[PDB]
Every structure is written in structure tokens, then in C-alpha cells.
Amino acid sequence: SSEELARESAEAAWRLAQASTRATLAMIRGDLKELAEALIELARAVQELARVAKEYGNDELAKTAALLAAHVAMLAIWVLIRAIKEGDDEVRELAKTAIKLASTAAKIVLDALPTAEEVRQITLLAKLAEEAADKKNEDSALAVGIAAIAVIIALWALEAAQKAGIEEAEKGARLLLKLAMDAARKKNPEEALAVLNAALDVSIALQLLQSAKRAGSEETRKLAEEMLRQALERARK
Amino acid sequence: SSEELARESAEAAWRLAQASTRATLAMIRGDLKELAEALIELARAVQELARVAKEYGNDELAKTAALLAAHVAMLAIWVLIRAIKEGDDEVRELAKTAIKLASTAAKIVLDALPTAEEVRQITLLAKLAEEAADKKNEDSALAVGIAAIAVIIALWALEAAQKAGIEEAEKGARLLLKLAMDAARKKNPEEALAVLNAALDVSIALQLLQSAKRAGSEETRKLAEEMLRQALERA
């Protein structure tokens, strides 16, 4: 029922914003207990958004829920590393719960969109962050935390590459997602950080490409495509 | 000269990425000193990008530069909050200089795009955060920090509403910007968070509407209608 799809998705999208606002406020103040406990509430809302997208087969709604799961998993690692670095077992377990809640949400999207490689990479990153949480590791969780940020930036470069349809842009977003997940499985903070600056490099090129596509001045497009390829080679080698 | 426009735009975008990486790296380690002084170098990069768009009249490059200036000003409020909350005068002044550098960047975009309402809102937000800096008041700075990120969400909701061309989405992004800036001058974090939540409500339906290019996900249009109604009652 399309009426029921609009009902459940709208009410889950409202609970999504409610939890996002609660987490943003705690992100300012540094209240890690409230922030992690808010990422739990946020991970639930992403989970039921992935569940409604599976029930009604809305593939676009599943992709949105997968993107949100990646953001919750990434934030929960920054809370995880800052908790084990402060010896807070209560906040560490709160963050761990937020990780696995977002992991199950990604696995729900992976059940609806198994042939979506970016959803697989999101699911692998969350399950990889699960391991870093049960590990009580300040170094492995730090590495997957860097790689998580590189994935998030590459995911926005991908969705921005969907617009305008620049294939050199989405090809680059794919390369960064693979090299970030490769650096995450390697658990090397140096490699993941190298993928991070490359993801930033091409995403700024993208914004420069989109400001060069709009209202002419397409000379800013040439060197931003060249900047895109320079940065992709900065990640390859 | 279009050759020099591509030249200086690439040079400034390169130093923008180098400073963006330096800030992200310091944001991981929690080095608020290095993070603040990396937002300084990032604010100068946005200021050079705004200057370039001004001289060459690239309105699109000026709009993106204003967007960046708003981000740097918002990140510097984050740092200012955690600085005055920890009694760090060194980091508080480092954040203050980053706010003023981003404020100047917004002023330069305003010179090139004075008829852009969103550029005026950003310039007022940076000047208003500049006062919360000299005041070193953690409550006023927290309100303008929430209101800042509420402005950011309303700006992407604006940019997405231009693509979709939905006038109800454009009018909605405008009223959220006005209510956020009002909440920022009022310096009350409560209704500032409310405008933030409403901005998220509408923007979720816009991101799903922009991803709904492929199939008939017309239920997303019902997501936007009801989210825009919820945001109208938020006024």
C-alpha cells in the first residue's frame, strides 16, 4: 500500500530528525554518554527506516537508510575511541551497541540491495567496527574511524556524482570506497588517512566541477577534472 | 581572463583541501590547539576562494565560497564552546581569529552577491558569532552554534530545492533560514534546535526526492509535503 509506505516512512523520518537533533546537541557539548545514548536512538530509527524500505521494496529509500547507517557507525567510532581513550566502559558499551544497531540496519539494506557494492562496503565497515569495539583496541578502532570518515566523504561524492552524471566522478568515488575499506581491513591509520585526503581532494574538485558546470566558466572544470585524476592517483599509489 | 580564473580557483581549492585534511586529522586526535589553528588556515583558504570569485564575477564560485565560510564559522563555534568550557584562553582566541577570517570571507561574497539573501544570512551569522566570541559566553555561543548548523541544513535544502524546482521547498528553506537567524539573534538554543529538527525533516524528504529520479517514488513527495507542514507549524 503506497499510503502505508508514505505513513511509515514519514513517521520514521521524523523520529530520524528527532534523534539527529539530540545527537547534534550532545556533539557540541562533548557529553559522550548523552551522545552515544543518542546514537543508539538514532541507530534504531535508521534500522526501522531500512526495515520499511525492505517491506515495500523502495530501493531509493533503502539507499538513504544505508547512507544514514554509515554516518551512525562513523560517529559511534569517534565516541568509541574517545571512550576507550578515557577508560569509560559505560560509554564504550553504549557506543558498541550503537555500532551493531547500525550494522544490522546496513544488513537490512544489504538484504534489499545485495547487488549495491557501496551497501556491502558500509556493511563491512560496520561489522569491522564491531570487531574494533569488542577488541578494546585504541589503535584498530582509530584506524577504522579514519577509514569511516573517508567512506562518508566518498559516499557524498558518489551521491553528488549521481547528479550531473559525471562518470569520472562516480568512478573516483568507487575507487576511494575500495581503498578506504582496504585500509580498514588492513587496520592501518596511515593508509586510511591517505584515502581521507584523496576523498577530500576529489570532493572539493566536485564542488568546483559543479560550480564550473553552472553558469559557464568551464575552464574551472578542466583543472578540477585534472585535480580529480591527480587525487585518484594519489590514492592508487 | 578565463585562464587565470581556472588558475587561481585551482590554487585556492588545493590549499582548501590541504587545510581540510589538516583540520580533520587534528579533529581526530582532539588537539583543539592544532584543530583551531587549522581552522584558521582553512578560513584563509575560504577567504581566498571568495576573493577569486569576486574579482572574476563567478557567482557560482562565490555561492560555494559563502557555503564554506559558514562551515568554518560553525566549526570554530564548536571549538570556542569546548574552549571557554575548558577555560582555554589560547584556544578561545585562536577560534576567535578563525571566526573573523570566515566573517571577512562572507563579507567578500556579499560584496560580489549582495542580492543573495542566503549570503546575507551567512554574513550576519558570522558577525553574530563574532560577538559571541568577544563576549566569551558559552550559552550565546551554543545557541549560535546550533543555529549555524540549522542554517547549513537549510542551505542544502535550498540548493536541492533549486534542482527539484519545488517552490514549496524553496519557500520552506527560506523561512527556516529566517527562523534560525532569529533564533540566533535571540540567542536561545531551544527554538534553534527546533528549527534544526524542522530543517532535517524537510531535507530528508528532499534527499529521498533527489534519489527518486529513477522510479516513481511519489511517496517521497508526500514526505516533503508533511515535513513542510510540520516546519510551517514550527514557525
- How far apart are alpha carbons B170 and B148 in whole angstroms? 19
Helix pair angle (A189-213, A219-236), 10° resolution:
170
Place of cell 575499506: A181
Do B150 and B165 lie in one domain? The reply is yes
Q: How far is A10 from chain B (nearest CA, A)?
A: 5
Contacts of B208 in chain A (CB under 8 A): 13, 60-61, 64
Q: CA torsion, points A128, A130, A133, A135, in degrees to nearest 10? A: -70
Residue B97 burial (C-beta neighbours within 10 Å; 0-12, 13-18, 19+): middle
Task: Work out how many domains chain B is built from and give that number.
Answer: 2
Domain edge (last residue) among A135, A155, A177: A135
Establish how many alpha carbons lie within 13 A of residue A196's alpha carbon, considering only the half-sphere containing its beta carbon: 25
Do A19 and A81 lie in one domain? The reply is yes
CB nearest to B226's CB, from A10, A20, A21:
A10
Domain range spanning residue A57? Answer: 1-135
Residues 92-111 of A with CB under 8 A from B: none
- How far apart are alpha carbons B75 and A28 in whole angstroms? 10
8 Å CB contact of B217 and A193: no
CB nearest to B21's CB, from A14, A59, A197:
A197
- Determined by which method? X-ray
- How far apart are alpha carbons B64 and B67 in whole angstroms? 5
- Please choose, from the candidates A81, A69, A234, the residue with its C-alpha nearest in 3D space to the C-alpha of residue A144: A81
- How far apart are alpha carbons B232 and B212 in whole angstroms? 24
Do B161 and B121 lie in one domain? The reply is no
8 Å CB contact of B81 and A223: no
- How far apart are alpha carbons A151 and A139 in whole angstroms? 18
Looking at B85-218, list the stretches that DSSP marks H as alpha helix, in order from N- to C-terminal side: 89-112, 117-134, 138-164, 167-186, 189-211
Q: At B125, list the grid cell.
A: 551569522
Q: Does B5 touch chain A (CB under 8 A)?
A: yes
Q: Does B162 touch chain A (CB under 8 A)?
A: no
Q: How far is B133 from chain A (nearest CA, A)?
A: 16
Do B129 and B198 lie in one domain? The reply is no
- Please choose, from the candidates A103, A1, A106, the residue with its C-alpha nearest in 3D space to the C-alpha of residue A55: A1
Do B21 and B129 lie in one domain? The reply is yes
- How far apart are alpha carbons B43 and B34 in whole angstroms? 14
Instruction: Using DSSP, state whether B166 is helix, strand or coil.
Output: coil
Do A196 and A83 lie in one domain? The reply is no
Domain edge (last residue) among A94, A113, A135: A135
Do A205 and A105 lie in one domain? The reply is no
Q: Does B220 touch chain A (CB under 8 A)?
A: yes
Place of cell 520499511: A52
- Please choose, from the candidates A206, A144, A143, A127, the residue with its C-alpha nearest in 3D space to the C-alpha of residue A173: A206
Q: Does A11 touch chain B (CB under 8 A)?
A: no
Do A128 and A150 lie in one domain? The reply is no
CB nearest to A21's CB, from B64, B200, B222:
B200
8 Å CB contact of A13 and B207: no
Q: Does A8 touch chain B (CB under 8 A)?
A: no
Residues 165-184 of B with CB under 8 A from A: none
Do B171 and B94 lie in one domain? The reply is no
Residue A139 and residue A186 in contact, taking contact as beta carbons nearer than 8 Å: no
Q: Which residues in chain B are followed by a discontinuity, with C-to-N distance exceeding 2.5 angstroms?
A: none
Residues 26-55 of B with CB under 8 A from A: 28, 30
Q: Does B64 touch chain A (CB under 8 A)?
A: yes
Mutation to test the B interface, candidates A31, A60, A68, most B Cβ within 10 Å: A60
Do B88 and B4 lie in one domain? The reply is yes
- How far apart are alpha carbons A121 and A65 in whole angstroms? 14
Q: At B157, list the grid cell.
A: 535544502
Domain edge (last residue) among B136, B157, B185: B136
Residue B46 and residue B100 in contact, taking contact as beta carbons nearer than 8 Å: no
Q: Does A17 touch chain B (CB under 8 A)?
A: yes
CB nearest to B197's CB, from A21, A28, A82:
A21
Do B33 and B127 lie in one domain? The reply is yes
Do A10 and A24 lie in one domain? The reply is yes
